[PDB]
Amino acid sequence: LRTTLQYPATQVSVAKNLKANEPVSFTYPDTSSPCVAVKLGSPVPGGVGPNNDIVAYSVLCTHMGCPTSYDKSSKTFKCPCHFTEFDAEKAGQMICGQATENLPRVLLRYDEASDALTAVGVDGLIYGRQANVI
Amino acid sequence: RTTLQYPATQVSVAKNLKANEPVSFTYPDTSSPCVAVKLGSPVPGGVGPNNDIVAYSVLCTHMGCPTSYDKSSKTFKCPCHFTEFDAEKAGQMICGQATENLPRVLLRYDEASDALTAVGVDGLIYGRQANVI
Amino acid sequence: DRITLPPANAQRTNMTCHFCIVGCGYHVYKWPELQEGGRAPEQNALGLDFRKQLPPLAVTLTPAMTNVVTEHNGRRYNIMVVPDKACVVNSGLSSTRGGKMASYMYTPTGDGKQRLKAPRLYAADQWVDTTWDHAMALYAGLIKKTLDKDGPQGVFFSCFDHGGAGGGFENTWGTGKLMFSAIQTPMVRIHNRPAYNSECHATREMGIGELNNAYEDAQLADVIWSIGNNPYESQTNYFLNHWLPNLQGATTSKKKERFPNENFPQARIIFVDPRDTPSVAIARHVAGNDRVLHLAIEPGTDTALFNGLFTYVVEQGWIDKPFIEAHTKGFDDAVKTNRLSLDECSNITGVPVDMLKRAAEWSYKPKASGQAPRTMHAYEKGIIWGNDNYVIQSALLDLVIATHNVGRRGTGCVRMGGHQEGYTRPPYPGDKKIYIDQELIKGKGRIMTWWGCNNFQTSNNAQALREAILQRSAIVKQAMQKARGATTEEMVDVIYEATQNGGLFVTSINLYPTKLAEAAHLMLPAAHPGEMNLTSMNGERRIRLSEKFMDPPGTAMADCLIAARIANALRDMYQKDGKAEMAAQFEGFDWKTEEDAFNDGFRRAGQPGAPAIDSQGGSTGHLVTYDRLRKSGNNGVQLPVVSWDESKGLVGTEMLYTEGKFDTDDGKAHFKPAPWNGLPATVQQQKDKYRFWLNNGRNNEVWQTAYHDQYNSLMQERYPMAYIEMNPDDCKQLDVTGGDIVEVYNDFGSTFAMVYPVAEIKRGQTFMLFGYVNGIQGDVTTDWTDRNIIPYYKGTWGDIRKVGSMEEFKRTVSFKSRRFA
Amino acid sequence: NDRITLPPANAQRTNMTCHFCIVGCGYHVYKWPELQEGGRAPEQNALGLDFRKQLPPLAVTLTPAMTNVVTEHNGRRYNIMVVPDKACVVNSGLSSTRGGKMASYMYTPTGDGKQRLKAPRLYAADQWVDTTWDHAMALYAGLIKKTLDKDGPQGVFFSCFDHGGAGGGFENTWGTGKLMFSAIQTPMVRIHNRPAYNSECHATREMGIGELNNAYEDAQLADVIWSIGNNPYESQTNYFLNHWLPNLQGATTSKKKERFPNENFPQARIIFVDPRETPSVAIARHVAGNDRVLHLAIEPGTDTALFNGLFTYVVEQGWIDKPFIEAHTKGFDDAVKTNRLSLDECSNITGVPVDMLKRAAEWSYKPKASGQAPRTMHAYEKGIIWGNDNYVIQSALLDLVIATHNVGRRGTGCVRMGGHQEGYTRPPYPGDKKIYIDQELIKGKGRIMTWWGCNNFQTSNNAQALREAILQRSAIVKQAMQKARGATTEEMVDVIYEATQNGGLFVTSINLYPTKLAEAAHLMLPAAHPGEMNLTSMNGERRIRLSEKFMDPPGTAMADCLIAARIANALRDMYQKDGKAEMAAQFEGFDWKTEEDAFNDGFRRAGQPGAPAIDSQGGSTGHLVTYDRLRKSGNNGVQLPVVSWDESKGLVGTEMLYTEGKFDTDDGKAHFKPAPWNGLPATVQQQKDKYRFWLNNGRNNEVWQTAYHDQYNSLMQERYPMAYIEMNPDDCKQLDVTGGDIVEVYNDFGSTFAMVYPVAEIKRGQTFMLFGYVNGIQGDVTTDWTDRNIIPYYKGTWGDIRKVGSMEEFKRTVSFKSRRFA
């Protein structure tokens, strides 16, 4: 059959409502999958919006699933369980730690006509699931 | 789920196959022609008591023309653009225009019944998005 | 398993095959990773119905024709690279080489994992990354020092001059401008020959450019000759899409509609090749034995063959006397100089007199309706790398001109080609013929750049080359590693001093490290088509644009833009030192994209205020632009362009010489003498000493030096080592069989191969895969070259010694017949 | 990839010890046919986990990197999944980032293992080609025979692993050792990580204390842990995570109190002796609080002064165990005199404040309120093993441990942390000379050199000088061989040998991959790793496990012990053909078909009747271990030495050594030793006098060793495209460098290159560079200096740093954020 999962399209907010380096919590692609979006204030890789600086991630650590905390100052996600850290400015690259996958990126559509930010897929496999869509 | 659901299709029983006398069958549906042969000497993915029974999709992996089985050389030959595939080397392309070896039909050999059953395919059959349509 | 179909609205771009001359047209579909097309035909970009089995011939589609690429911004995209059904070149055919394109695009995890993506420096006895700026400071620093102290004669290059991937009109212009106009060095060879020379001097001098017809001509011919050529393997889709339809009878109605008062017998084909090939086997399969002649000449006897045929046709009057009278010079002289009886021709060539007479009757005796047969004469490396390139072409062209087999439809005397073509350069800046490998071997030069070639694998006399370059490189390595804390300036001085003591600084500009990494000091990352826009033409002069659709790996760059970077680094250095005259030599490389190089070179040829430019596009090249090529699609335009306007698009030229105006002082084709001299002494000496003819050349599946193939698991399983085709009785005598390893050796070198018994190989003759990554054939080729420094790569003899049985080859590699029956 | 193929309920499952570090975490390998898959319901997959809804945290370690699809020699394809064992006592289901990549590093034709050696490779006619096994053996045996016949064994050189896990283990060290020492009988042998045939732990072993003398449980029972010259979160990850951190968190307090009902147990505390502040220090402070952690940020190379000051102090305070000293030791009074150092002088030398020295001693050695001495476990690794005079530092440290009775009591130990796993069984080394092999090769000795499971081009001390010499000598052989035409094996052996009389050296590498050695080697032989073969090894508490075969090796790759047998048998056959019965007999005893045959011949013959002299970590009870018995023991194995075996109890072993005070010496007593403080060695001091930066070097948590697998891993290469150097930010500002610039690092010994990595906690005039890497080799700047047993001071070198330039792609793609957690 088909090779792709059927991802929902989940509205997050509109881009101008996000303040620089003030993260937004949301669930995607279901209520058991916590995620963060942040407007980082300076352009980065996968960044969307008018300043190519809005990114989002799954916050479940890809080692053993402990929820990571977002450090607004260093623009990093930090896992309290075995001390892995992931760089929000480098598409989830593991800075140091015990995981074998980068932090999954939530793919965001930015729609200039409406200003809307919509989550539309995930790059990488979220912790604790056989596929991103259960 | 990551895997296709392949049927289990009875081909025949091993003792009914004569050495180097191919059997035609369809798998995993009637639009997918295949050949099974007992090669008479062990090879690769060979099953049965002499580890010598193999099977393949016969659609050429270049552009889909049906290949003919040359019983003498143990090769499949495509008349369209002259590709050949080695039945004794898991479908390796000997020469030709394809970019994939000839798909192997996986055979279960059941000693208790003597049955040969087709249970999957290794490689993608010509002309389909997935082996199971 | 399964394929992700392109969505109906997937992005689609045009791509010419990266590889052989034929230049098959392809589409690249690109779409986001997590999206997929529907099975219904209007819901995928292919327009095909995947809800039920597709019929045969409907598609060329395997997993190898797909990939997933990751762009510099981190976004991932599906790609699917498949042949264009509406392209006239291939009509939707894909060879096994071009079919792997999608697999050979760069991905961090796939076959392209080891692509160069950063400058690499060998320093402190180790490979490290370095910055672009540092690489340029070292390389420009050494070039400046050399120019200042030694002059341009100290700066050596071996550079592509071809089209397609790792060539093309942008790239040949950028490199040529750098080498010839800016550095002004004469110390340049070409990727496939060790001097700056033409493969086709004689034909060009006689008035006949070597790409003088259309691929449609092969469809209109009564007879095709394939001379020193294995076209099913080496020009696959020309053979498949144009030659075989003729042999099958599919073009008979076209011939009869074009020429209502002319008989068209069934088409016939004649091969001149010492070796029986896959191409002969398939021609016999399709047309029957009675329509095919294999003139299985003794190696190196082409000139005797053509002089015998020419002598015979003149004696029979199977020539075009009015054409000769009106449009040629030198006929009577050539009749005298090239006289050879059929008996003497037979004795030299080994071909029976009756087969010689049959070939001439099929090809040149007038048809019942009165017209001469339309005989297309196609030739490639079996004579271009044959026994005296210049003389064989002289002999062949004589026969063609006398029989008027240029300028009529269904005719031509043409190269089959190797790579695509895409040449636009300044004139070569001297008048000396310089054998570059020999000069390097003798210790000349301070700096050598290999640019889009790998002569470790492909030079003639390759072992002597490697030995010298490894030695001289090591001198530089030893000196560099004694440095501590050296600034760029200091390190340039260390290197220069080592080159005064026998050393050579070696740079490679390439997609991959290659074997050259064993000697190189500096490697620079290049980009291939699709990572960049690129133009080039096929063997009927059909120019197409290959469109960018992805990013190159890391900081890899288009070769023309590497050239610009080097030129600008040199300009800046000269400007800093107040050397205004030297700085001015490096002007004219203010290029940001490859279209800037197309504008500066191809599009300026013959234009007011332009410098001397030698371009395959000629003076009408300015009519071509990328936007116009894009509109033309994968059918492009055959050069020369005649006209452009919005309503008609680019309009070009099907066939050359249709009015008998040749490219000579007087507009006439010039006959030439073709003396028969036997084998050259250097070659004859090996033949006198050693038992086997070491023929060599192409395999259908392997492309060139296997620079991508070496990373392809299917390729490495099939051909883990270079193979040598050997006669079965010879194998029995040597106690070898398929999958044994032999050493092949003569005075020039030694190499190794896996034995491949082939029934059709003649006793005392062999055929080894050239250029490979595991067992380099060229080690046994001699240093002999013709008057223009063209090597007789096909002319070498050697002995064969059993090493032993390679168990794993026997278990895993097919040694079945690659010749179809 | 947004999905994983689950193991079916009935998938094949085998046991695998991690291939990599000492800890030896236990894993399971699930193997099943390619087109099958497990169900999401927990009883329908082999994991027993419920994939019908999100799994909770800590339920699983499972990513795509922990899966693969392998193709066997018969062409059949199988899914594999390599995941940690929750019920193994070592790791309790933890997986480090290194072992978590195992499935990715298994051989497949298209994945990270694509470039595995799978055929013999020969460099001939100035090119690499394949050759046959028989031809490779005829050349290699041919040259060894010629050399033995004309020069003797002194002509035949090796650098070979002596470790456990992948590329080592009891079968492989025995096969190689029997070949080098019993058959060839060459003394010209170094070890993978040191340039002579020596011990890392001579002083401790001589004093009567084997270096793995406790259990990992002891770290859970300690009051105080010292980590000396060690970065355990990065280098012994799951020992730190599964045993140390639980103690610091208070999770083991109830266990201590239940074992010792009349003993106070304060909150556990941890002391690091390391010039550099590391991720391990950062994490300890995060977990325990600053007030429970002491970082003794000593001046480089001052360990001996530190321990002599501590020993002096504890003796002056009477914080020692006088009855233990009297009953179970020798040499105390002499050591008190020879090692006397005041706290003020100790403080001046080490840079550590007197108050921190006194606090470290009070936490560690002052009796608790209930009367008993603290249980202080002293753990050490390469910061002192490769430190300023290995022998002397251990002498100084052990003196402090013995006087304070911190061996033999539960919750104590003075132990190596270990590097690789261990798995040594060999004949004795066959001479009594200390031979510095790299120096001998550089000076032109030897006809043939084999690198076996190591890559000293990346890992020798003074590595540039080694490379330069080996390239030079190898090229002499290349030049001579390429003049041959039609040479028979005998003829080519002659050509090669004559080149070695003219300065040349024939070079063989036996390896998983070409490596940088391919730039010099003439012959390369393909080896197999655990899972393509059975293998035994032990971890840092002597826990021996069997790693089970589950797939075929690539091509004709072979277990190292069987490569050794192939060589031995080739030599035996040659000698037999030439009628040399005495020489043929030296090569008997390699009639091996399987790696279990090498286990039987070596480990299981130690100390047995009629056996030759065998030096085995299994000792004389090793015969009690068999593969079937190990299999039954599972990933918990048994701690060596084995005490007993029967069907009902299985293998029973030994938790802690020295619990009755019987030490490994002539008199059964632990022997104190003098520990002179001599300053930095002159060779090192000379570089420090001339150049600005301390060039500290060592491990990164993510990178394994020489990156032989990592170099093919796209995630690894993206993160660490070049070796990095940690530098103080004020130093960076002065040199106008920042993250992702390339510098040259250099001194008299060599030059190398690295990408700058500013790190706040690095001290001014100190740096730290990743060792051993494939792009910027650190060891170029290490000196030739070694201690009395030829142990290098790899951590002892100074150099200058020069800016090359800004590497734009590193700045765009590589994180230079803090690897130290807060």
Ligand SMILES: Nc1nc2c(c(=O)[nH]1)N[C@H]1C(S)=C(S)[C@@H](COP(=O)(O)OP(=O)(O)OC[C@H]3O[C@@H](n4cnc5c(=O)[nH]c(N)nc54)[C@H](O)[C@@H]3O)O[C@H]1N2
């Ligand atoms: N599959 C594939 N196709 C390719 C290439 C590739 O690497 N792979 N390379 C491309 C390139 S760059 C080129 S230049 C072309 C080469 O295309 P071809 O020239 O067609 O191929 P070759 O195999 O080099 O040689 C052609 C024939 O020359 C014959 N020959 C040898 N000696 C003589 C002689 O003395 N006289 C005559 N008459 N014939 C003789 C050989 O038997 C051989 O069959 O192929 C191109 N196409």
Ligand SMILES: Nc1nc2c(c(=O)[nH]1)N[C@H]1C(S)=C(S)[C@@H](COP(=O)(O)OP(=O)(O)OC[C@H]3O[C@@H](n4cnc5c(=O)[nH]c(N)nc54)[C@H](O)[C@@H]3O)O[C@H]1N2
């Ligand atoms: N992630 C990872 N783990 C590994 C390895 C690997 O490659 N990767 N390799 C394994 C191997 S083989 C080994 S041997 C071990 C090494 O394990 P460790 O020895 O723990 O690691 P290193 O980084 O070599 O050095 C440890 C510390 O020594 C300190 N040091 C330097 N000089 C001195 C000194 O003069 N005195 C003191 N007291 N300390 C000093 C350094 O600052 C460093 O933090 O790790 C093993 N584990």
Ligand code: F3S
């Ligand atoms: S697919 Fe490519 S290799 Fe030649 S035959 Fe066509 S251009």
Ligand code: F3S
């Ligand atoms: S997973 Fe492996 S690398 Fe060490 S920490 Fe455990 S043994």
Ligand code: FES
């Ligand atoms: S669960 Fe995040 S580091 Fe282990």
Ligand code: FES
């Ligand atoms: S369809 Fe079989 S060779 Fe083309």
Ligand SMILES: [Mo+4]
């Ligand atoms: Mo060519």
Ligand SMILES: [Mo+4]
């Ligand atoms: Mo170690």
